[model samples]
Target: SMEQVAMELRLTELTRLLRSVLDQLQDKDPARIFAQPVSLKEVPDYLDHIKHPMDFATMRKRLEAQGYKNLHEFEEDFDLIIDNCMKYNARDTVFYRAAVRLRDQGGVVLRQARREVDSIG
Candidate 1:
């Protein structure tokens, strides 16, 4: 049962790291700006400009379903969440500012997790 146990341990590790990164991202978001999907009604051209939109809520659901294959993939989605906002909103907007901070701060959080997990392997 070593193979089975190893697979499950890998998943468990992924879950732990993902949750840690997500928790900080959520905490950094005070306005709940990144909590849910963007409202298309308000920004009718949202999809036209941003092809791959991402949000915190979607990430949470995907995490629950074990949709991410690895930490790098999850990190890509996290970057996408910020990149989309920076693309859609102007520099003066709240969304853009938040994305900038998230990119910088969240980047550190993920990097630290990578180091911590690497030692465990």
Candidate 2:
């Protein structure tokens, strides 16, 4: 059924959302450091381990210590970011890989767009 598929997509969206925040908070690049630290092994071995870590443990702990131990927690923060970034109908377009457009959440729209054409509108 479509519902089942939608459920799967939403779960994936959580991952998608996590990836974006991970990019914003730590990696600084969506693919930077490594893929979103969802598991203990997803983190790559950091040699020049500057911000965050190549090991998922370091990254995971950071999120956990910050009261964000899972995708949902991370996603919630993204919403908050959106709230701040979207004040006054802010047409920002925060760049994180082009991923899910969660049905219920507004984007933490990036502000780089100086014109309506580049806006998420």
Candidate 3:
């Protein structure tokens, strides 16, 4: 329970930080174009044939063909997605590490989450 709470808090903090960065970017460049939502309907079924680890050039071409005029329009969204993925993955790794530590110690030890919960409770 404590681990879950800590993970959620960390996720929230990461999301807030990301939003702040994006907001600042937008404020600096009001004309900045964000990625248009990809149209699943217009995409060809042949896309399914594309293999994993798709090349950036190929992916850009596909998006361009789908009427994406500029790749940079999607760059922010892509970067944010990647950043969030990394942060969440790190949080997960920390959770696993805590579990391993607990197991190795043969019992639960005081952890960051426990202190956090105690403060709130």
Best by TM-score: 1
C-alpha RMSD of each candidate structure in angstroms: 1.4, 14.0, 17.9
**Candidate 2 residue-wise lDDT, 1-121, digit = tens:** 9999976665554444444445444333343322333243532432233232233334445453444434445445444432322331224443222222321222333222113212322
What are the TM-scores, per candidate, against the unseen true structure? 0.91, 0.27, 0.31
- lDDT (Cα, tens digit) per residue for candidate 3, span 1-121: 9999986665555444334433433343232222232233764542353222222233344543442223244333344433333333354575334323323332122133234434643
lDDT of 1: 0.86
Q: What is the lDDT of residue 18 in candidate 2?
A: 45
- Please state the error at residue 3 of candidate 2 in Å: 1.0
- Residue 84 displacement in candidate 3 (angstroms): 20
Candidate 3 runs further than 4 Å off: 35-121
* Candidates sorted on lDDT, descending: 1, 2, 3
Model 1 Cα lDDT, one tens digit per residue, 1-121: 9999998878887887778778987888888888999989988889999998889999999998877767788889888999899988899998899899988888788888788767765
